[PDB]
Amino acid sequence: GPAKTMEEASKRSYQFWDTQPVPKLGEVVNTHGPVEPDKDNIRQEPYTLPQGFTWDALDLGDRGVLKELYTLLNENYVEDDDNMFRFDYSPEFLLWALRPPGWLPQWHCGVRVVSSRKLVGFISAIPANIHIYDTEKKMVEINFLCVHKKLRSKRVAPVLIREITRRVHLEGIFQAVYTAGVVLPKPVGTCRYWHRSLNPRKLIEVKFSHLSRNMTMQRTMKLYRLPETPKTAGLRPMETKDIPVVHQLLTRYLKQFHLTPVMSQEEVEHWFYPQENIIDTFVVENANGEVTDFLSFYTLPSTIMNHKSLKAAYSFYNVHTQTPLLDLMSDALVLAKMKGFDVFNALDLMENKTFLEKLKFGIGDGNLQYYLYNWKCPSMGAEKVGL
């Protein structure tokens, strides 16, 4: 079905993506710029869906409609290689991910069955200023492309991609950014997920991890046993007064990478201000009262498809200026362990390879490919991806 390796991607032919303004897989890119110019007259009519299906923009402020969306995502969205785990989306998490500053309701693009009005498709866009090499451009982040399992392999994904493209074209944006575990034309970077076990018994019980060849259950827990409290002086939850300095640290820290977001202070508030079961941010306030570092990870539980529920933490943004990142992420592990997380997940992007092995992370079986729509630029190493 999908190609997960570049070698596996040699087989595939892209009947759809060959038509899109994206670089070709095999081609080596030595340029910076769009694949196609801006279109100055935009199709006003929605693209045709297969018979019995119609468009409907999802008003996530409506409770029942938002319930349809997570019920769709909780039952039909991204899975593991072995169909054993699926993300478990809270209504509040979707509001956090789908209603950042500048969100537009028409960018909550759903597909319903005409006769029943049942939600069977979705795709999203949120506004995002992206720094890529020497260029900053207003783009969108495309996420939650989802087709109901009963509708699969019926060419609905190209329509969602092309309709969301049209609705973004109407608002004047011509580039987009998105990530995926499958290989498409053409990844600008490939990042690898690593996993840090916090509650090995539960992880091993549900077969999320295995005991390495020669450990026992009680040996494994001692290997991954963490301090009961964090090491770092003056580590505390982020507060409203920290929003400017958090924005300041994040802005300067991201400048060393080649693929980063460019956040306003209001966007920084939305994405980092702690929300229970959604996002946690802890700042380091030193002996002078200045905030010099922060760590963050978001909450995204996993549903166990055999089935009760696996709570996982995902590294988000971790900025260091005076506190070693190793000690910053070690505190993150401890803070996540307190909060009851079973596993701490992080990609090998940014500076994360410098601490992954030392902090007892184990490499995962899934990659995350980063893509740009209508933007031709050289690929980058994972450590240059800051998105």
Partner: peptide, 8 residues
Amino acid sequence: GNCFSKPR
């Protein structure tokens, strides 16, 4: 996060 990884 647009991928689900397990420890390999």
